[PDB]
Amino acid sequence: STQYETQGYTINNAGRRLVVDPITRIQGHMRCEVNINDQNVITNAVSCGTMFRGLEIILQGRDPRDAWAFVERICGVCTGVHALASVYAIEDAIGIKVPDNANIIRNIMLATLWCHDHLVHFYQLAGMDWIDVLDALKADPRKTSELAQSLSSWPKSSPGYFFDVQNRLKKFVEGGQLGIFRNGYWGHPQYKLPPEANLMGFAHYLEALDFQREIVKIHAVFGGKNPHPNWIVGGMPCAINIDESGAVGAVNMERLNLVQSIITRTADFINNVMIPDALAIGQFNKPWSEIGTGLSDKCVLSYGAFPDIANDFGEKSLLMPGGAVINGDFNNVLPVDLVDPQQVQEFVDHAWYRYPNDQVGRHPFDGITDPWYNPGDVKGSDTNIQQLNEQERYSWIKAPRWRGNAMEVGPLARTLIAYHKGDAATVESVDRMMSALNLPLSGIQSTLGRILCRAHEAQWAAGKLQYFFDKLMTNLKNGNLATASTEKWEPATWPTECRGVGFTEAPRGALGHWAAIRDGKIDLYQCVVPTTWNASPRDPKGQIGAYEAALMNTKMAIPEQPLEILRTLHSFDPCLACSTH
Amino acid sequence: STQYETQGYTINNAGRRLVVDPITRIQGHMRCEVNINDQNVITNAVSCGTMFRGLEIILQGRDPRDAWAFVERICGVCTGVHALASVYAIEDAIGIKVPDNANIIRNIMLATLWCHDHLVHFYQLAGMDWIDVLDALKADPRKTSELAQSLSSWPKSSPGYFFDVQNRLKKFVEGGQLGIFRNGYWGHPQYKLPPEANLMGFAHYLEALDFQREIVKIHAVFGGKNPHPNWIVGGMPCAINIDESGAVGAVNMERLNLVQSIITRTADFINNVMIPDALAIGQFNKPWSEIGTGLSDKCVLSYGAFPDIANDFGEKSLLMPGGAVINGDFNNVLPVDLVDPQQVQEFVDHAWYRYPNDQVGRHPFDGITDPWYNPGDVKGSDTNIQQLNEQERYSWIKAPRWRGNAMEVGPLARTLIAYHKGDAATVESVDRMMSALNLPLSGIQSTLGRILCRAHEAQWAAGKLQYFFDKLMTNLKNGNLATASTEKWEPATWPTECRGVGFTEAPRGALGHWAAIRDGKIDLYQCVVPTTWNASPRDPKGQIGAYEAALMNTKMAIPEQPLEILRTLHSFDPCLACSTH
Amino acid sequence: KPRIPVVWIHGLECTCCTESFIRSAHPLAKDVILSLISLDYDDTLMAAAGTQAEEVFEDIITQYNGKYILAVEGNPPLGEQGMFCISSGRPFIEKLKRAAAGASAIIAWGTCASWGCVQAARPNPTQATPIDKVITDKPIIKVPGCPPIPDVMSAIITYMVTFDRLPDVDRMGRPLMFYGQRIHDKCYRRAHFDAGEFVQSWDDDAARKGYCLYKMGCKGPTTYNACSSTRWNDGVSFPIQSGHGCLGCAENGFWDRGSFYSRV
Amino acid sequence: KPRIPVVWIHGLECTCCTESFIRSAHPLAKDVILSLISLDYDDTLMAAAGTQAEEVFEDIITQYNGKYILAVEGNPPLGEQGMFCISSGRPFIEKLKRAAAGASAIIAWGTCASWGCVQAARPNPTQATPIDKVITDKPIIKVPGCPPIPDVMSAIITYMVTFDRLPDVDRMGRPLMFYGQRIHDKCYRRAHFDAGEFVQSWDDDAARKGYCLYKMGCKGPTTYNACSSTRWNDGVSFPIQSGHGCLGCAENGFWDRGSFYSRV
């Protein structure tokens, strides 16, 4: 065994090893291993991405105009965000400026995805870590109604409703076919909600499962379909025609009316179902404001997103701020430059790839994706792993660092950055949330806080949808209909050699695509994705990434039942296909 | 002034004359006049249809296959029912038998219409006679939530929801733009609901206004569109393909899944919103079980509807029973024959039409539609009717009689017929409903009873939707896909001369179309529609129709504010375009 | 802020256009009424009847003279001195004229108000006449169809409210947005038409594959509307999708252009 | 009555097909799970993880041996001894083979499971291989698309449950009901194709009138799917309707047929 110190942690792989493979209620394939001491406290954590496809390799030699469509298939959960990063990157390389309406519609696509992805995560992925579904069978329907009505104006709260939901669940489990509930962690001592709150939450899980399908109708209008809407280099393909012949063949008033109807419904659901449920989880699980901090009190990163001034990716334009904090110094939000070779770098000393020198980091314009499956001295064998060897290569995920620092990305990271840059809306929302919970601001830097910040961001994004829609309509009222710039569509108009960066904030955090074009074709295409940051393996200094750090020092009630590990991992909304691409 | 006796009433046109023109919250154009005595009790009532279009005339010379499309435009409220009666009539004339799935689909079309039309009537047309909308502003939202939860399992009952509805109404009224609520009867002493019941009812008005749009999606799948779906002589045009190439071009499993989803939602809404609201109106307005009896304790008529055995219109097939009662003798339900010239006849001695002898009634196969506007002395002029002359011709509506008797048709009529034929479901339902209200069976023969029976029938029809859908799916599982018979599509296959009758129970009552075909074209097309019966003017014996009878003997609290007249008229769901055609 | 006043009157009609309106999916008709317009007169929905309804009509057209939109459903009959359609004891045409005089603009909903529809079909017993042949001094937007598509009606309303102008129209007064192209120029069965793949009798193998309805009398090739793109009832279907040819219901005179089952 | 057991496994994939399933409008995915099937294993939704999830998988495939349906999303990589996709420390292909052996039938959701999809595009770094090249002794129904349409997925499920049989398939194993015709055979822009009315550059006047996307690279002419009839997301749109040509995403090898913007 070995022990070393990094980032205020003592990383010690003596003692009992626990393995969780597969991790479920995530996207993609993950393995987690931990060591626990005699006191059932995690002293070592190991994050492993167990899949790889090689989009960066597949993209070589493709037409830049096609790249969005390939990289969109990095992930169907965060669907659209890679397409957005891609058209941004190709436009940056070539020198294309899109019309205002295209930018506005792209911002609507992104805000729609934030609403959808955050909502579904809360209920379908993370919810069962907090809500004991089987305990809902013990609730009193009238007390459930009274609880719901004390928390929200949401209409659906009758005693008869909650009785009907409870009876549906009773019938579901009556034949012994428990389905997704089979062999769960029900009754674990860490389930703290009373029966009535479990029934309320379960009802809401079902309501969210139904309602989420509506949100993505906005993607269908502008992008054709969801999952995997369509985009173009130069803007969007959804030409607009409000008042001319042939509007039946375009985005017309009827299509825009559909979009408005979805926006209103989405804000209502988020504000009156998800927000009060997140606060209720907080109220009953306050100890989790001190568990899972990880890097969130040390190093956090946002690139920024939602440029309000078309084609301007600077600080005065981005509605979701960018910046970095290191060394726990939230008084110093630092600017991020994605071209600077000393800022974003990826290491592979602990990953299944080849570099010429694995002791140094490579900026994505110098990136290399040369897969090399070499797990070394595992317990078991290379095709039958009992324990990864975290002293050697242990993941398909590369290790990104910012100026050599290991960073957390995602809703909590963004919230901290915006708060400390003085964004008034973020400060007001965070302060009101933490006051409602009677918790200090530091309580947000935790597993509970990640969940609270996600809910905050769903509400933020739902409000921004309206803002963007109104901006689009203002342009239309002024006769500004344009949705594509085509003067550099043809390859002969492009520079013979050029490179660009496309970046945004996906639901799970900071996303970048780095592209080089030469002689009309993709010469290099490197992606660094939010879960690449968070699920990162170690670097040459032994520095641990956000997941491994958040798991460190966690108490387990029952070693064989990994509820605490699941709670913290799920609080990041892991996307493993994104992480590996 | 004059007086005479008929049907147990004393018809006296002494005293003050009141005019209500236009009658609103009906379809089409109606005028009503009454005389009241010194006790403000109605002693004379005059029903006048104030429109005519002449479809019977327009139909002459048309191809029989086209007839349904024309007659469907008799009315867009009871949309589909005239097309159904037309295809029945033309198939009866020519001798066409349709496949089982066509019959089942036609029964689904009719049941869908019953659900839609009855629901919209209850809230949008009749509801404001019972609910004081402005008084809803005085309700306590928590007590409204308590009331709603005591009546129903319906989910939407939170205090916050009722406050939000109330606040929306407050903001709508506060700027003085009261819209459809302007100059209403609010505060009239006959409004008996408490404020909480008025708010609950108003919330449900709005819920029904939204939800009704969904019900007619069934019509869109099978019939293309609503209003005014499409049909064919020989079956239905909606060819089915479940498991073969090209199912994208036909009614396929996805289309049937859509239909099933609408059925379930429709039953849920009717059973948990409309039914409890109807019973609550009953509970708070029990005196109206004694007002507006009219002909409902004397003479009632149903033709019957919903043939369950394809092409069999007999008693063993029709799921909604037919029959007639006269002379208040409910112990002898009489059979109806639509070909028998001594049964259905129409008189025009008090209507704006010419017959060679206006003292006799004409069976529809001998019908004549020769419009003749001749109001006589109306205390103004031919283009300024101040007072109709009910001793002379006073309506565009013909006067139908059955064996010379004036009949009531519609939900109450049907319910009485089925009850007294011993239909077990009907007996059980009616008895349980009257027991719940602590009223005798006779209480159903009233204005209140008309409303209760309509709600009853919406529930019945929603159940029958599922039964018919299941029958369709059984046939599909057995490989029986046929939707049209075309052996007699071509006119060269038809009899040179033939005639037929199509009949059904529209939402408002007994509907018949009588068609004669000669040389490939319509020679005669006569319609007798439910509101023709109910809104009928007088006959040569002076006998009064259902609306005039139901108004007789009614006390008015405030003569200038005709709330009691509106309540009773609206209880029949008048459709004036239907009545005149 | 105040909402634009709207007076909705009804001549000879079947009420299909009013029913279509309340089918709107987006915006819901509820939200149109509560938030977008002030529906100040409407015989189908309003609380007041008789003298109270006459008071509303008179008050609104007087208070808001020059400032309200008139919606018209149905048409006036010229036969029998107008007394085939009577309102408040007098010819409907008198109410139409009074309401038109104060309106800023008129929306002619449906084929009835636009052209005549079924009551004007041969032999037109009542001498039913479209709105634009009676009212000759006001802007009239024709929104034809029997009835027009629900979400077309609501889109036209939202356009006018949002943009504070009337839609641009074709030479017949129909909004270009929804009536600029033929059904057949946006019909999903066009591939079959172009290949000569036709339904020949109901429920034949061709019908079960969604072949073209031209030989069954489809009038899509001569009809301008949005049915084949916007579709009906929240996009669920349209006549052709459910297996019946277009009747031509948005076009002037469609009842008298021969049998619905005779080819264009 | 007990519900049919279903095991849903995931190889190399993006999760779009699972996402598509939950978008179903009718029946709702909630109702499919609660009432129509017993979804007994699914990594994306299930409560159990790790050893508890391995126990579920074992228990279900043993207790219901020969009686469950296997749904597969994604595909196995043959490169690096299969360790481009690792589950429970072993190659994913081992889990696929064990699940397949007990299944009564297999549903290959999506282009990944059916053909290869994006990871199999040149140069196929992981040697990703479709399901039917590994499993050769079980019925496999291919439901291609990237992803397939939500209500197509739910209709296929309902068909199988209601009729108690697999859908009839074409020679490639695709259900005839939804894959028997080309996108271009049911495309509402076909009138424009046949007239030579094409978009030539994005947002040109043709594009603003909904002209055909052939010259912009539409692959509808060579693609079999239901997108132009059933459409996407409760019938709201499809790629072409929103102005982008079909990519060909339901067809084998569509990534390597040249640029998406090159004409078919």
Ligand code: SF4
């Ligand atoms: S069905 Fe009618 S509109 Fe469609 S292609 Fe054929 S003829 Fe044209």
Ligand code: SF4
């Ligand atoms: S848009 Fe594509 S599928 Fe449609 S007609 Fe043109 S080429 Fe065919």
Ligand code: FCO
């Ligand atoms: N959100 C998201 Fe997916 C990840 N990680 C991307 O980008």
Ligand code: FCO
């Ligand atoms: N219901 C209805 Fe209409 C009437 N009266 C018809 O038929």
Ligand code: SF3
């Ligand atoms: Fe909507 S009233 Fe119905 S008949 Fe043809 S438009 Fe007229």
Ligand code: SF3
């Ligand atoms: Fe639904 S996993 Fe998404 S990439 Fe193309 S089908 Fe594969």
Ligand code: F3S
């Ligand atoms: S009949 Fe009318 S509804 Fe549309 S498809 Fe033809 S214009």
Ligand code: F3S
């Ligand atoms: S890209 Fe795919 S989603 Fe349909 S329209 Fe083409 S098959």
Ligand SMILES: [Cl-]
């Ligand atoms: Cl016409």
Ligand SMILES: [Cl-]
């Ligand atoms: Cl799996």
Ligand SMILES: [Cl-]
């Ligand atoms: Cl492929």
Ligand SMILES: [Li+]
């Ligand atoms: Li740029």
Ligand SMILES: [Li+]
């Ligand atoms: Li018959």
Ligand SMILES: [Mg+2]
């Ligand atoms: Mg990368």
Ligand SMILES: [Mg+2]
């Ligand atoms: Mg008649």
Ligand code: NI
């Ligand atoms: Ni992802």
